[PDB]
Amino acid sequence: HMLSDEQMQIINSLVEAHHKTYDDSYSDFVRFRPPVRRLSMLPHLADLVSYSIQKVIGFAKMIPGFRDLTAEDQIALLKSSAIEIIMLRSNQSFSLEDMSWSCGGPDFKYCINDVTKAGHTLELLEPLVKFQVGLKKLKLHEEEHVLLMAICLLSPDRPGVQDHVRIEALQDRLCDVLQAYIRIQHPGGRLLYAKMIQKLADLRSLNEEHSKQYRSLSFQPEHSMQLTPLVLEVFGSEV
Amino acid sequence: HMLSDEQMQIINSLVEAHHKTYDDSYSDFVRFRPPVRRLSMLPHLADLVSYSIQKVIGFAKMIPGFRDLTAEDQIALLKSSAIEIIMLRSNQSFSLEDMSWSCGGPDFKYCINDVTKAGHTLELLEPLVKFQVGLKKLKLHEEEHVLLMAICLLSPDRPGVQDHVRIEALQDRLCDVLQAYIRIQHPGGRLLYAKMIQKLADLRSLNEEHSKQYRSLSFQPEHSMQLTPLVLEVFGSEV
């Protein structure tokens, strides 16, 4: 058995969308407020996350069907999944060798301790790193990684979504494309689809914790003033 | 004739307030988004101006009597005079030799062309530089420069001020301190006080132009997203 031309088109469009929104040279990192290793890493991490939100918007806009949704559903999907898409996409810079995210030089090498310097606790950081390890160990094909981000983004079970039927139909088409890809293109991937669905569940707990910790930081005007307008709009509750 | 101990105290407090809020090493400049020489200088200039607003708040809080005003009057004074205080204080880095603002290396050397790269036009830039030249040529004593910033900040003729009587009384005390200082401490300064009052008038036209140009930039969400929360709050009209 094989995939249809429609399924092939979806994969090509998603891989193309990712290549357009993910820069392997990390050359834009020099434009952020520099990393400083109280809450010394906050300016750099805020600019890194703000930059990554723009990329996620860019990728989302190229997901087939996403642009056809109302502006409000697109916002609802983006607002609640952006941190999850960032966590998923960050896996491409994550290394099992040093348990850190390496984006070129040691300048842009992020460890747990650095994230602690933006105000985060081990309550988020330890499960984040365990998630990164587990996902890296899945050794996902670029096609799978890209399908997983798009599946995550198109979850109809998010607060504020209106056209739940349309979104769930878009996500299902993507899950079928994923199941068929693993089966046809991934040897030894018999248990893979299920493992990927579990990673999406893990992401909900990470999102939950991140939201709590962001709420705590953002409440203090001395730290909130260090954020960017886009971060305030996306992670903010003013929906 | 001489100054009273009260007048001496006011000058010492103002000079001390300025030394505490103005860093001659410009060492904090490396923490801003770097200068890029469309609208390439916007991130750096936004961070420079955001940093300078914090300094102006800091200086204002140490102006005798300012802290006794209501929070609302302090906001009204700060919101409409901050750009003028920035223009006045910038004169300390302005050089007649190169007609630019030199803050250490060529990294932090700002010319008219660089400000053009944050979206400004010659309508603001040419009168700004002419103001900088004229003010530098006044060869103000540190005591005079500091008195001029405090006089500017305590102008009761600003939109949104409530306790106009109190503010005008604070500013008058400062103008008397200034007039007496020039007379007693500045040789050849017979025409100086009047020249300084004219510079405050010049600042109103610069403020007027800056407000127009800021309104134009801030209306576009692609540039407004590059601003900092403090800049949006201070230069914004949401009073």
Partner: peptide, 10 residues
């Protein structure tokens, strides 16, 4: 409001 989001979504 979502001024930035709307604009980025074009």
């Amino acid at each position: 409001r979502h001024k930035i989001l709307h604009r980025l979504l074009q």
